[model samples]
Target: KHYDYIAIGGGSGGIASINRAAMYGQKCALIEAKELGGTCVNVGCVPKKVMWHAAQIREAIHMYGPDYGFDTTINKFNWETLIASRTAYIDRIHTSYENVLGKNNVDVIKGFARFVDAKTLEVNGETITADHILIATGGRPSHPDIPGVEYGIDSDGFFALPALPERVAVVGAGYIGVELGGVINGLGAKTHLFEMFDAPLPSFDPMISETLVEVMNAEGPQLHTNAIPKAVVKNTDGSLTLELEDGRSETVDCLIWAIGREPANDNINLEAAGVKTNEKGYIVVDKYQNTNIEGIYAVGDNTGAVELTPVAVAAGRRLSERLFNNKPDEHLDYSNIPTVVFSHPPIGTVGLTEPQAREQYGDDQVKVYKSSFTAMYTAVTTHRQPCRMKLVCVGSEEKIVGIHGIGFGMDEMLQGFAVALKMGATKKDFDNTVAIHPTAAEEFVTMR
Candidate 1:
């Protein structure tokens, strides 16, 4: 049977596109080999955030409870209970996705899908056709090319562990490594992070990266810079040994490879459909999410765009609008997307970094305003954490081009400010606005 639209991957992007198309009175079908909701709902963002929150609760109880006048006692954390609760939440999400698709009258096909041609696909020993097909299979964690590396687990394994490890070593300095390492360390594990570079989360702004490295080391997880793992060897006592390039070795109960993620487009047989992919195996798509073949498209991690869950949802919805709702020019703007990393204190950023702004507008045209202080929540406690905020502006009017902050309240504080930056808010406008007074957020407006 033929469908008006068929989404090849039951992910956030694919579901958004299929649901939108079906709502527009088009027959749509969704295909998936595993559980619904894809990576975000299953393994990546949803479960990862749950673990991060668990870490936060531990922090509050251990560090802040006594200072807040609460009788702090020796508390026991049951990893199994947290995992079960998190899994229950994920199960509910899966059910919700199923109910939404069912209510929209979209057919759900269960199996691995492969392209028969540009407009045709084969799933579960049956060939189906669609006027439009969307590929949003997302991605999976990548393991380094080393012997005995299979003994080590990836981010997915980090979530699926039955019990917390006594010691954990995370390889890579990206957001995944920092986040996982932070969570493990916060939960009383002897955690260490290995980064090829000089600091963790190196892709972020230098100030944020450097501050996180220092803070993490001072608080918990020890950061190992200039450490590149060359091989993995299993010890006799059922532990793992990581061999580094500099002739150093570390043994840990768990070794997590948070190195990177690869696109999940390999099994879809893109070559058979004549879909073009770049050297790194990411599907190549235009601004409108169009593949080289007509009526074929890709989004989310498969296309290697922004790779954020919200980004995939937005792009998919806009693609549906453009294709079926008579809005021919609708597409997501790939610029100035806001992002947050759930580190110990958390980090929020949007628009270009200070370096990027300086490079784009030149040093003279770009100016930055920064504020650093101890957050009120920690200031009263014996342990004080730093809060730092930066606003990168450009041109004579000083239009806000970037907003970045690393602190306690910054996570919830960034969304509204991101909207202001997106709307071209200027430094003068921020200065003219009244400060909220005595809050971390007020610094954005009051910063000189």
Candidate 2:
């Protein structure tokens, strides 16, 4: 089979690229293995967000409910019910994918596809060729090679679990570990989150990291720092005993390894296609998403650029627009993208961190405006979680370079501010804008 464009890895990037290409009347086909939406739909974003909503609900009933003068005793949770509902919602997304592809007349090939050459892929026993190809295979969890590592599961295994365990221990201090640690505890599991660093999400702003630990410590999923398991032993009772390198051990019913993710380039056989990959096994692509091979391109997690779903979609769509829509010079800007962590109180951020900005623009040239307060939503409650926010501006013009915060409504509040950062908005622009009353988002514009 031959088409004008062929996309491998039916993830968000591949889907967006082919859909955009087909819209311009160029023939396209999508090759996917088990699922159409890949990690974001089946495991990553959709399910995670679903669980986040559930976690928030659980927190609301147990923490904020009584303070609001409501009886919180009857708040019950069932893992089976949540998973069933989430799957039911996920099924509709599959239907939409099928419908959209059908309407666009894009061929949907279901199988693992391997590159046989620069422009050819073999799926099953059939060979498919295209003038242009996109590889968006995405990523998979990376497990450490500790003794009895098999005793622990990864992020994928977390979603696949039939029920929540009584005790859960998550290794790693990344966003995933923090997100899952709180979710597990909120769902009633005794969670233990271990980090190699003193604080979780150390890569983020120190204020954000410190605030997350502050919130999670008081909430649940007791945090442990400077500890990483060196070995694991599964007992006959189906529990695991973890031995940490720092001379400590933990016994838990379940262990999760959220150390990191590796590019899903193992089975694709890129070597045969003469494509270039980095030492870390990630596909190497340029600013325009062009691989070393002229007609081939890679995006999303596979290329290790941003490694977020929306970035992949934007990059892939922009590539298609430039190619098919004749919109020359169309490409995605990789800077100033917003990201949110679904931690307990949640966090949203854009641009650089305080340390990052200072290093790039000199300490004297960077001015940071910060706000620390108990958010209005939680202020009236007996349990008051603090909201910490900061704006990092640079140079005499005071151009905004970074925005970070942790608190209620943070997940929804950063999108608007992200646009301001993208357009090179300065401190003066934020100062000139009127505040929207008592909303948490108003904190950004009103910060001193």
Candidate 3:
């Protein structure tokens, strides 16, 4: 009925929040209607990444020779097996999170939760009251209200399809749509991508986005940029067709809407609870994760604060400590976080963009370092794709401002480099590090 702190939504955010709150011996309870570990664990990052990597390996085998310089062949690719294995991996993670909460004595309630008031929540008809309540509720895909849009599904549903689509028409050029569309292509589907924006991954650097677009286009996925979907057309035989704003259309086996996600606030009844949110339904919280209403806090995607798992985890744990563990001053600094988008070649970025760096440090203060080369994986192997890296630096000292790249192993390589960017590592610092020969990561240290 009551807890010292109640964490709403057991995604990465709420999980970390409740864990840290319980560390102070506070009675913390977490509530979730969906599977545990939230989207990252169940649908978004974890499972998607697993499937993405599987697709990559499959593509590698197709591109390279059977022997790979040995009497080995990985020619047998099973789509069903990949899907099943990814689902099992996520289930294991969800169970592990459940076990952790149980071990820490944190109550786990599985059901829909809504704000009864600022201090109260009605979870599956059970009234829960707490001294402090954290709304770590995450986000969900936004399916546009176009006519017959119900025929189209978002990235989330596409992954759970009854069977792999033979052809897919992906709507939206955001990272989610692009990544999913590219993966579908890699997995042997004839994929068509439609973006309302001028280019894919519109939030990132324009040049890099263009580079990726060129590569994907050359690889045979039909791309439509600066195009809007007018309606979801239907075929008499039960396939899908897409009508565009430009008076053009295409037909495919299925349509996936990767447009974007919105804050999961539709059922929270924020008005009754006096919790202020933006027009987009994102909870408005201060740096301390405190809502306008006292004793109520919000974090993660619901708060619209840099929607990333690591950000949610850090903020949630800090909020819990500040509220219950006598660490009243603990708060999260979201700036300079590292993130990777697993697109066709993958992209990693941190800190300010080149334009942001120019604006902050002055036009003359910024310099860029960029390199394009064949990665070790593709070096000995045969593949037309090339790995690329770019670094934006600021000030005459050339302190790293941002890092962006599209390549294999960019995910792992960027982790260490992102930390350096966070620490204000300069071009000289990158150069001073000794390069390890024959590794893709070493290129970061040796690049101009």
TM-score of each model, paired residue for residue = 0.98, 0.98, 0.95
lDDT for each candidate structure: 0.90, 0.91, 0.83
**Residues 1-448, candidate 3, lDDT per residue (tens digit)?**
8899898898989999899888888988999888898888878888788878777876766665543654456675676887888878877887788789989999999998888778888987789899898888899999888887999988778778877788899888777887888788887789998889888887787656877887887784688888898988788999888898889888888999888789988787888899898888899998898899999888899888887899999998888778777788899887788888888788888877777777888888889888888766666754557787888887778888788888877788888887787777998999999997777788778886
Using lDDT, rank the candidates from best to worst: 2, 1, 3
lDDT of model 1 at position 445: 91
- Residue 138, candidate 1: Cα error in Å is 0.8
The residue pairs found clashing in candidate 1 are none
Which regions of candidate 2 are displaced past 4 Å?
A: none
Estimate the TM-score for candidate 3.
Answer: 0.95
**Tens digit per residue, CA lDDT, model 2, 285-324:** 9888999999999989999887688998999899999889
Q: Between candidates 2 and 3, which one is better according to lDDT?
A: 2
How many residue pairs in model 3 have overlapping backbones? 0
Mark the regions of model 1 whose C-alpha exceeds 4 Å error after superposition.
Answer: none
